[PDB]
Design an enzyme around this catalytic site. Structure first.
Site, PDB file in Angstrom:
ATOM      1  N   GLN A  19      34.714  13.013  58.583  1.00 36.71           N
ATOM      2  CA  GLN A  19      35.706  12.157  59.115  1.00 36.71           C
ATOM      3  C   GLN A  19      36.238  13.070  60.326  1.00 36.71           C
ATOM      4  O   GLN A  19      37.145  12.253  61.040  1.00 36.71           O
ATOM      5  CB  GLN A  19      37.432  11.916  58.452  1.00 36.71           C
ATOM      6  CG  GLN A  19      37.722  13.851  57.645  1.00 36.71           C
ATOM      7  CD  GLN A  19      39.078  12.915  57.065  1.00 36.71           C
ATOM      8  OE1 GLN A  19      38.435  13.026  55.802  1.00 36.71           O
ATOM      9  NE2 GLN A  19      40.247  12.831  57.146  1.00 36.71           N
ATOM     10  N   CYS A  25      41.176   9.805  56.541  1.00 38.11           N
ATOM     11  CA  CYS A  25      40.082  10.105  54.768  1.00 38.11           C
ATOM     12  C   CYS A  25      40.465   8.184  53.984  1.00 38.11           C
ATOM     13  O   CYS A  25      39.411   7.960  53.264  1.00 38.11           O
ATOM     14  CB  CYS A  25      40.823  11.113  54.045  1.00 38.11           C
ATOM     15  SG  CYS A  25      42.439  10.454  54.324  1.00 38.11           S
ATOM     16  N   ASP A  71      43.558   0.641  49.429  1.00 32.38           N
ATOM     17  CA  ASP A  71      43.867  -0.695  49.161  1.00 32.38           C
ATOM     18  C   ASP A  71      44.625  -1.741  49.592  1.00 32.38           C
ATOM     19  O   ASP A  71      43.868  -2.725  50.537  1.00 32.38           O
ATOM     20  CB  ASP A  71      45.586  -0.770  48.448  1.00 32.38           C
ATOM     21  CG  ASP A  71      45.203  -0.880  46.916  1.00 32.38           C
ATOM     22  OD1 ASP A  71      43.974  -0.604  46.563  1.00 32.38           O
ATOM     23  OD2 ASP A  71      46.362  -0.427  46.380  1.00 32.38           O
ATOM     24  N   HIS A 163      45.697  13.069  50.510  1.00 35.07           N
ATOM     25  CA  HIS A 163      44.258  12.618  51.238  1.00 35.07           C
ATOM     26  C   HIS A 163      43.586  11.710  50.196  1.00 35.07           C
ATOM     27  O   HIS A 163      43.683  12.015  48.441  1.00 35.07           O
ATOM     28  CB  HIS A 163      43.835  13.815  51.099  1.00 35.07           C
ATOM     29  CG  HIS A 163      42.422  14.406  51.364  1.00 35.07           C
ATOM     30  ND1 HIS A 163      41.745  13.813  52.386  1.00 35.07           N
ATOM     31  CD2 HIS A 163      41.336  14.686  50.808  1.00 35.07           C
ATOM     32  CE1 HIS A 163      40.726  13.647  52.706  1.00 35.07           C
ATOM     33  NE2 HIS A 163      40.107  14.723  51.694  1.00 35.07           N
ATOM     34  N   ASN A 187      34.131  13.821  48.295  1.00 32.98           N
ATOM     35  CA  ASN A 187      35.160  14.091  49.689  1.00 32.98           C
ATOM     36  C   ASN A 187      34.076  13.418  51.292  1.00 32.98           C
ATOM     37  O   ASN A 187      32.989  12.996  50.901  1.00 32.98           O
ATOM     38  CB  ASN A 187      35.231  15.267  49.690  1.00 32.98           C
ATOM     39  CG  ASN A 187      36.598  16.505  50.928  1.00 32.98           C
ATOM     40  OD1 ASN A 187      37.682  14.718  50.906  1.00 32.98           O
ATOM     41  ND2 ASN A 187      37.042  17.098  51.149  1.00 32.98           N
TER      42      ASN A 187
END
Ligand SMILES: *[C@@H](O)[C@H](CCCC)NC(=O)[C@H](CC(C)C)NC(=O)OCc1ccccc1
Length: 220
Positions: A19, A25, A71, A163, A187
């Site tokens: 990222q 994230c 979401d 995160h 990650n």
């Protein structure tokens, strides 16, 4: 449920991404979960555009490099009727105007499912659905320097997460303290962080770092 799960062995998971220095994230967590569910449906694994989410999902509530929620990303894909591939809409690590092009859309979703806030429910979802988007408290130096083993941070919060990451499985290994279970977490800090970009986070230790507090996946 099974004692061990790893959806990478089943073809559900793209390589680790980076990222950069953008607070995106949530977008990498969301593309990871949608990559898994698209693969479940089509048998094709296609890397998806985080930049499309950063630039375009403001109307669903997201705030680009200033943060967001998985979401809201799943809602954008549904509202928008698509999401461009990583290849077509590459990652630039800064927010710009939306350049979505439906001709390059490679994914869709019909909403999402929120998992009850219990590690037992997260385990059932990971065992049966695929990789799951989750939020964790990653705000500790111990998380920056993680190399291997089961990550446990006594000061981790189960309520204040900062995160978004992706649970791709779970398992166990024998340890000194006999706290042996872990969530396998992808990650988005590149492959030089952690164990090739992954961390094994403590499982069944009072919802460590809040990993079961905001878990969800898209409906495909
Ligand atoms: C991860 O790179 C970012 C870093 C944010 C600081 C720049 N973290 C998030 O985006 C975080 C992820 C959730 C905990 C899953 N969410 C966040 O910071 O949200 C802020 C916000 C909430 C709701 C709507 C808009 C912004």
């Amino acid at each position: 449920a099974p004692r061990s799960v790893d959806w990478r062995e089943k073809g559900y998971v793209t390589p680790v991404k980076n990222q950069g220095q953008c607070g995106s994230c949530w977008a990498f967590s969301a593309t990871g979960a949608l990559e898994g569910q698209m693969f479940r449906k089509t048998g094709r694994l296609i890397s998806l555009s985080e930049q499309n989410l950063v630039d375009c999902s403001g109307p669903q509530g997201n705030e680009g490099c200033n943060g967001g929620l998985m979401d809201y990303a799943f809602q954008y894909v549904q509202d928008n009727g698509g999401l461009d591939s990583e290849e077509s809409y590459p990652y630039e690590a800064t927010e710009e105007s939306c350049k979505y092009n439906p001709k390059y859309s490679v994914a869709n979703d019909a909403g999402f499912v929120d998992i009850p806030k219990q590690e037992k429910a997260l385990m059932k979802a990971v065992a049966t659905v695929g990789p799951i988007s989750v939020a964790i408290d990653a705000g500790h130096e111990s998380f920056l320097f993680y190399k291997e083993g089961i990550y446990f941070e006594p000061d981790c919060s189960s309520e204040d997460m900062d995160h978004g990451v992706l649970v791709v499985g779970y398992g166990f290994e024998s340890t000194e303290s006999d706290n042996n279970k872990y969530w396998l977490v992808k990650n988005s800090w590149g492959e030089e962080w952690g164990m090739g970009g992954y961390v094994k986070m403590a499982k069944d230790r009072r919802n460590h770092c809040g990993i079961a507090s905001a878990a969800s996946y898209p409906t495909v």
